[PDB]
RNA sequence: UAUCUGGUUGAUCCUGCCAGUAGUCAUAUGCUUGUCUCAAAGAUUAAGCCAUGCAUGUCUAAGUAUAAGCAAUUUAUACAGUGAAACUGCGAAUGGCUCAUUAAAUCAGUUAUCGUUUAUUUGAUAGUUCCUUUACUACAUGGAUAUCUGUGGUAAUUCUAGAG
RNA sequence: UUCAUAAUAACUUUUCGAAUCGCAUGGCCUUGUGCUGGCGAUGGUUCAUUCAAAUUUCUGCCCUAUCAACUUUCGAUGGUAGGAUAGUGGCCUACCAUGGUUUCAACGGGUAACGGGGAAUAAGGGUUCGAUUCCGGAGAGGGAGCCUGAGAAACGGCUACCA
């Protein structure tokens, strides 16, 4: 009885299971942006839908009066920092049209691929999980990390491990011993 | 059940401790004393969560045993003494005296007060009554009873208290156009002037109180504490000074002020 | 190579506890882990405290080695450090001794076996010796 | 037999369950305020007894081994000053620091003197603590007499101000 | 983040229901199960039953000490260092568990106690006890009871009877 | 306010007004060991305050008319007086009056009902759930009765009867 640490079943399924075009359209997304699950998509869709839900419940009220203006702006501020929303569009009514595809292209997954490094997309997810890639001076092994647009530039290979060039790749310790034997 | 309650469970812990949801099933029950359960502040919260002079309750306990801590002149060794509103807490090692005063948000604040002024405690009324030997006596909402007061120290009117001796330095009357600090929930820790006093028969005396910014607000009398006449409040108040800004106003001041 | 680049954030000086209490941000450039005995050497030379009076805890490195964020105290003296600090921290450093004691349940069994009797145990032992004939 | 103690004032030569509070014997109460029904034997003697206690008040002919030959001295004695004053029979004028059974106990080679913890005296520290309390009693009475006089004066000072304001129209 | 399909027909459009569909800090189970953080967990049926052990006791410069205890040594010719035991004090009415009762009852907010108790809490504080006033306990009144000393019982028990 | 409080009158199986305790050993000589005085502890009186405590105001519950009357001999509703209680009171007692509630569902029954906070669901309106981390309330096998105590109708107290 400290307190129930709250949580959410955050990421929530669609209300049918077999809309053929959705089943493809979700595959397309998991193929383009390399997602192991449908979950990874619904995760974004819900995470996004929560925002949308705010935007609707702000746009119901008059933008000029307080919450509408403040919470809406803070909601926009949040998105532009996370880098989904453009700098062309900061008008709340544009937040309403954000979509899942724009959210995914902001993940650390993709911003590896968009800055080169990996080649062929998935490789990044593998690099990320395999403890390379440091956004700050701090390793990240979540693919779905959401990059901060400000921090985008700081994405490089880790101080530790290969590719940064500290230690080469764990079959060298095999063949450096094997070549020394010959 | 079966008489008074000895524990206080942390979620039930009054919010203006700013006690931590986790890191303990319980909260420190403020012990019995001059200030009401929720309106008090037990020293564990003061010395640990607020000031961080202790890293845990143990160290607070010892800090009170060695004994430089002196809440309102007297020493205290009580981990959960009701150090409520106005209570001058003087730590003689460091010389860091603190008056207990509400931040505009509502939650109490560390005000790193002078030698010096932390020497009187402002205190309200309460009573006016008389006791035995026909002695007229005054009582402070903020704890103490003081004997033989000036006849025209009336009710809901403040009194400066000598604190170390515990007598009467001076008093501020309650009436129209007098700087008034606030101690009631939503308007808690705001400051203002006083315009009206709706008398009201039975159902609580109201007071219409314009701040520096002249945003009017109403409270009840019981939640109002006359800090002086306008311009000169008798206590040194924290940065913010009882204004209470709007939400966007606070967001503006934060993201404007970025000095790395 | 590495140099164990120690730092010392949030120095809250404390006459009530007779210490400077603070966080220890630390680094490992290519080394892995800092270790505590190595830290108190680095806190001794930095604060003029000596290993004895320094008391550090918490840490838990970030991730990718990188960093470690301790919670270093530096007392005013060794005698001061002994009489304030909880015993377990004095055991860690080798200053105080580990308090050799009986198990918890055995202490409670010993409490209740003691609760069961009344007065002095010399009376019940002499009665028990008399019952050997019975 | 069986082993229930013959409580006095009970009557009958029979076994009786009986309610016994603190303030009597026959029950060592393990709560500060508590009654309880322990069993008890009556006061009158019957065949079922193993044991009667018998105070051998006045002596007779045959002294038996060491029941009336040897003498076990008193372990404890007078603690209070008025007790030591009765026991020896000294009165007030004899003064104090001695009449006490110090014991010379040995650990092994070392041999040194024990002593009691005797109470009650007109001690210098006792006297001064009374005089201090007596002073506080007087000084607190003066201070409140002074404070009462000051507000008897202050009320009169206000009373003159009321009379000046009132008389006009 | 307002969503519908299959089914009575020869086929049609309805009434209509059933069936699916999604989710449940909603129970159960069936497979399967590598890691990280977090983490409910004998409520549902029997407020059914309970071996064993434990979960409430507490002493400070500071209520009571000739333990025939420990101390031991450079305050005791009444006492003063530690202190088992015990009485006194206070606590054990807190917490914990549970949901059987219980349907204007409980309970929520709302008042009220000018209708009351309140150890503790921190603030306050009692020349008047005398009883005619020329020789009176007050620089200190009394005897008990416990722990103890033994005398014991019992088939048992955190049973305790007598004397000092 | 018949309040606070103050008076006149007394009582009373005359409450309380320290025959209590640890550290500190100062100040005047009427040169006694005199008279004097510091820092604390507990205790103790009603007034305060706090922790609370009992009541109590208003409004608010799930299903059932295959419950339309119910309460009032055995307190129901009111009154006068007492008794009790810490205290208000049909809380109890005497004497008196005949009230009281009801289709704006009294009363009765049901509840696989502890109440609330909340939970799930999730356009809006809602439905169902809330034993369960907080807040109330109850209970400690049942049902009683009580000791101590500020606070217990305690149950890691006791007395009993049933099981
Ligand atoms: Mg309880
Ligand atoms: Mg009122
Ligand atoms: Mg690594
Ligand atoms: Mg006891
Ligand atoms: Mg609908
Ligand atoms: Mg048909
Ligand atoms: Mg067909
Ligand atoms: Mg269905
Ligand atoms: Mg003693
Ligand atoms: Mg009156
Ligand atoms: Mg009282
Ligand atoms: Mg009456
Ligand atoms: Mg039920
Ligand atoms: Mg319900
Ligand atoms: Mg509930
Ligand atoms: Mg149930
Ligand atoms: Mg509860
Ligand atoms: Mg049971
Ligand atoms: Mg009972
Ligand atoms: Mg209990
Ligand atoms: Mg029990």
From Swiss-Prot, chain D:
Keywords: Phosphoprotein, Ribonucleoprotein, Ribosomal protein. This is Small ribosomal subunit protein eS6. Disulfide bonds: none annotated. The gene is RPS6. GO terms for biological process: translation. One of its GO terms (molecular function) is structural constituent of ribosome. One of its GO terms (cellular component) is ribosome. It comes from Kluyveromyces lactis (strain ATCC 8585 / CBS 2359 / DSM 70799 / NBRC 1267 / NRRL Y-1140 / WM37) (Yeast). The chain holds residues 58 to 226 of 236 of the full protein. It comes from the Eukaryota. Phosphorylated. Belongs to the eukaryotic ribosomal protein eS6 family.
